[PDB]
Amino acid sequence: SMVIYPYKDKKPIISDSAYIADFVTITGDVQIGDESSIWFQTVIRGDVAPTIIGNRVNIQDQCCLHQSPNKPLIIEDDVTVGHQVLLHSAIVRKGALIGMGSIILDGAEIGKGAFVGAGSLVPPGKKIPEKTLAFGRPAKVIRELTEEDLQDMERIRREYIEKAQYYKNIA
Amino acid sequence: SMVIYPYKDKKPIISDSAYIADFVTITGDVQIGDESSIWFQTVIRGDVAPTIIGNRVNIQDQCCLHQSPNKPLIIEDDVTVGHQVLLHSAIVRKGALIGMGSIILDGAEIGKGAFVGAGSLVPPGKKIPEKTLAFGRPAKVIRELTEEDLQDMERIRREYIEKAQYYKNIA
Amino acid sequence: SMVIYPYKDKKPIISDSAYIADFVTITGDVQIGDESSIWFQTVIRGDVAPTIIGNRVNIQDQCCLHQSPNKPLIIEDDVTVGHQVLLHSAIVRKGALIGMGSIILDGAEIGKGAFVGAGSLVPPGKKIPEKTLAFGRPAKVIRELTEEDLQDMERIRREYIEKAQYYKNIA
Ligand SMILES: [Zn+2]
Ligand SMILES: [Zn+2]
Ligand SMILES: [Zn+2]
Ligand SMILES: [Zn+2]
Ligand SMILES: [Zn+2]
Ligand SMILES: [Zn+2]
Ligand SMILES: [Zn+2]
Structure with a gap:
């Protein structure tokens, strides 16, 4: 099962259609939207600044979501967050x-439909342009994404919505 | 206190001599062989492609094992997988x-008796030659392993068999 | 919601003012000091060499603390260990x-008041001088820390003590 705690005057607001996997911790000022999924062993501590997760977002296994003061963690609709990612006050469009396996740091902004390659580091305040591939440590823009890249991203998003509904039923 | 779940027509097949630690998640199309050990907080989701783990394998704490379509995750006998490793459709001989702290990506093949150094990234489809030390991001061959290296690898594998037997009793 | 196990003749010695979060694993030869905090999903296995954690230390979420033979893991007073860090027989002053997201490897020594940047790797036996900033893979000394850097380090340490007190009460 999972652990859900308040932090002072803030308690998590989680959509009834969201999937919260086993061994997940969510605390404090966290909102999670419709058909979103928080996978095994993930931690979302909403005790420094607001965390706002949109609809149809998947946060895969063993992720850590946290904030630095006055820097909200904002993850917009239809985002995929890969296994073992660290988001710290990231803006993910x-x-x-x-x-x-990526690390996204304070104030960093990931543009709409952009792809951060596995194992990357996006340093504080760095912006990744919309619909580009960026990877490395620190991450460099490599190329513009193609329709083939975007169709793979759409397939993964849809697959996670379905798998989340399957596991929510099994659990 | 682990979680074991079927995925559709597949359920995990785990040898009676294996150790499954607390807070472990194992789902779907996963086979784990004799005297193998899956350590605390590890996630093995067998919901995309088959996962086959051999005999006397240790998968250390906080690992994440997953697949991409049509790319099996294969971990052969006598493999050591270090703390906090990500394996995604890796072939480990x-x-x-x-x-x-390494990341091994889709269709990457780790040669028999090779040593991937801590903190490495092996990119999709890349082969690490048998009995070499390779490290970095991306991993580069450094040297051929010596008898001293092989004795260290033997010691770790045998120590994990003994620790697994101890904790299986304590649990 | 944590797991605490002995290892042979050693059981963890944890201060009554320490906070041990949910889904934490602590085994064997581990000492944890006053007002210290071990955050969600962290593993501290004290089964190879001694682990000594001082007072007012925070070990953040999803860390893995382990040892290699004859190399103690030493974390002195007032240390901050960031989310998803791997410490393996590290000496942290x-x-x-x-x-x-850093990895600190066997016999590496982090000098008093030093700052290892996010996502760094400190290789076995490497020393980071006191009161310096070091980052990268492998970590390079960049510059001497300023009073502004030290005040940021003080703020994080003090904030963790208080949050630890809050969650310990909620749990
Ligand atoms: Zn944080
Ligand atoms: Zn046997
Ligand atoms: Zn995956
Ligand atoms: Zn063998
Ligand atoms: Zn990691
Ligand atoms: Zn034995
Ligand atoms: Zn270890």
Whole structure:
């Protein structure tokens, strides 16, 4: 099962259609939208600044979501966050994908439909342009995404919505 | 206190001599062999492609094992997988060691008895030659392993068999 | 909601003023000091060499603390260890900060009040001088810390003590 705690005057607001997996911790000022999914072992501590997660977002296994003072963690609709990602006061725009094993730091902004490659580091305040591939440590813009890249990102988002409904039933 | 779930027509097949630690998640199409050990907080989701783990394998704490479509995750006998490793449709051949904090990506093949150094990234489709030390991001061959290296690899594998037997009793 | 196990003749010695979060695993030869905090999903296995954690230390979420033979894991007073850090037989001196997503390897020594930047790797046996900023893979010394840097390090340490007191009460 999972752990959900208040932090002072703030308690998590989680959509009835969201999936919260086993061994998940969510605390404090966290909002999670419709058909979104928080996968096994993930931690979302909403005790420094607001956390706002949109609709149809998947936050994959063993992620850590946290904030620095006065820097909200904002994850817009249709975002995929890969396994073992660290988001710290990141702004992640609609339909972006954060490659598994990446670290996204304070104030960093990931543009709409951008792809951060696996294992990347996006340093504080850095902006990744919309619909680009960026990877490395620190992440560099590599190229513009193609329709093939975008269709793969759409497939993963849809697959996670379905798998979330399957596991929510099994649990 | 682990969680074991079926996925559609597949349920995990785990040897009676395996150790499954607390807070472990294992789902779907997963086979785990004799005397293998899956350590605290590890996630193995067998919901995209088959996962086959051999005998006397240790998968250390906080690992994440997953697949991409049509790319099986294969971990052969006598493999050591270090703390906090991400394996995504990796092929890890007999007796290899995956250094703690490494990321091994889709269709990457780790040669028999190879040593991937701590903190490495092996990119999709990349092959690490048998019995080499390779490290970095991306991982580069450094040297051929010596008898001293092989004795260290033997010690870790045998120590994890003994620790797994101890904790299985304590749990 | 935590797991605490002995290892042979050693059981963890944890101060009554320490906070041990949910889904934490602590085993064996581990000492944790006064007003220290071990955050969600962290693993501290004290089964290879001694682990000594001082007073007012925060070990953030999803950390893994382990040892190699004959190399104690030493974390002195007033240390901050960031989210998703791996410490393996590290020596971390008083008031140092280990940036989130870093890996500190066997016999590496982090000098008093030093700052290891997020996402860094400190290789085995490497020393980071007192009161410096170091980052990268492997970590390079960049500059001497300023009073502004030290005040940021003090703010984080003090904020964690108080939050630890809050969650310990809620739990
Ligand atoms: Zn944080
Ligand atoms: Zn046997
Ligand atoms: Zn995956
Ligand atoms: Zn063998
Ligand atoms: Zn990690
Ligand atoms: Zn034995
Ligand atoms: Zn270890």
